[PDB]
Amino acid sequence: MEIKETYDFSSIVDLWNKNIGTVYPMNLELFKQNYINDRQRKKIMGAFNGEILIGFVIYKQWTYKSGSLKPNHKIGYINSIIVDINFRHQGIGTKLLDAAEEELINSGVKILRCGSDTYHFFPGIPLECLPSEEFFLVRGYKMQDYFYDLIGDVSKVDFKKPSIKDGFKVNVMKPEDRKGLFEFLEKSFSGRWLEEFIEFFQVGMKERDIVLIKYKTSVIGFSHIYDNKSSFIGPPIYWKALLGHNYGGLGPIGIDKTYRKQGLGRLLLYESLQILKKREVKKMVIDWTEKDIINFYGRFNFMPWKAYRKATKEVKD
Template sequence: MYMDKLDHSQIVQLWNDTIGNRFPMTNALWHQNTTRDSNVNWKGSVAIVENGELLGFVVTKQFQEQLPVQMSTSIGWLQCLLVKSSARHRGIGSKLLYHAEEALKEANVREILLGRDPWHYFPGVPLEDLSAIEWFKEKGYEKTAVETDLKKNMRNAELYKLTNSADHFRVLSDEDVPNLVQFLKHTFPGRWHYEAVHYEKLLGTGREFIGLYQKARLKGFCRINDAQSPVIAQNVYWSGLVQGELGGIGPLGIDKSIRGKHFGLDLVKAAANELASRGVDEIVIDWTQLDSFYKKLGFIPWKRYQGMRKTIGVK
């Protein structure tokens, strides 16, 4: 059965029965990241149902949007592959994976990544799922980098003191958004630019970005997210696991011409201070390999993921 024909409530139920204690899914998040994402390859996204019971499913993606952004169409993604716990060791996962890979080959995909898709759930396989990692290795996937989500409790925490003048940093306004999009297009083309284009399309007001300015010119940015943001952002996906208000920081980037002057650390500090002023209790920084950088500010590892990839369709 194709995934777009399946009742989403069954999908969310299976997800939460399987991994909901670690990654609690909601209807809103599933609709945002899967149902409504035009990059889903529905031919490769299928479910196995037996006597009306959903036993497993897989979702595949390939970039399909008509946007002026640099996103490869030769890369495919497995957004998620889940099998009901009681239905494992029956070959269901292998059938789902085979179907997904064949559909992506047919779509001229040359490389498959696990997670990391536009509107992703994970940047890889959760590191504690050792059996899943070994299973994918047996299917021809190779390990890449380990990515980390970090977290910090901000309740009663003191605001950070910046090394550089606070005058360099401010929350953007709606009038700043077009300039931000152009900055990212030229300085950080690809995914970050793509996400900013969507932010502009959603009529974002700028409150989700801290800008770094030097001589009135935008030289850096940091994304900040909270419950009032126009999308459920990646660093607040799993808000059901924390008590109180969850906020998120990232991505962030600085023009290479001004690096090495503590602006990066200050940008994170300014972002955390802004979220604290909004009443955020905990902050998550997601999908990074810069653990030591963020540990300087008291962030500690929360979740880790094993990146994995497979080359296909090459004779």
């Protein structure tokens, strides 16, 4: 067996689907979008028996800015790792992660994260990969708390408009709103979400995918919505193959801190879902939520669907 670099995306995707495709169905469009467009220092290492790919790991170091946040070179990420089911418990996973980690470490990484990267596939260790938690524990990763993708079928329920205080208006974004949107993001959400807006606009997100809430003329919050016409495959619709026809999604969503706890998030969410419902969306996903916020979406009939465990390894000095 040999470990070396591979960018044979269709062999990777094939191996991905054979092993975990039931619950994380991958397609080449999504795989290439997320790998190729990522701006971090990144690599894919494969394990090979001659010409046959039998495992891989994808890994990154934080070298490119996230909005106003500077890149912290101390942070590295394991985007994914899979060994084929017919070659398990032969040390191949260990060799792949040893190679990833040793490279990262030499390049200055002191904190290693399971998923959560830019252009991630997973916010953390998926519950469906719960047995890998022990694999990571053996290597010195510590298990932390959970995040959740939520699912709901917006075609099946009617909701009541929350009671509208005056001056506030919710509308899909127009091209001329971009200036104001970026000023709002620089003020209120100036890290990863600011950078997603920059990147996603570069890779095919359209104004129709963004909903803005304004007080008078000022942008005070946003949501990102997705349907089967979106040109960018974003995290809510990564697993669209499980969601049937007329799939959709929502996330992220935020309100300026000085306007919180007035029912304005609930209004923005209500209006965002009506837009989707009018676009004939049925099953849709709200991705990468914390436990404490689940009930905010659950009033609109969303339920937890997938769970991911955050996990972190501190490199010893």
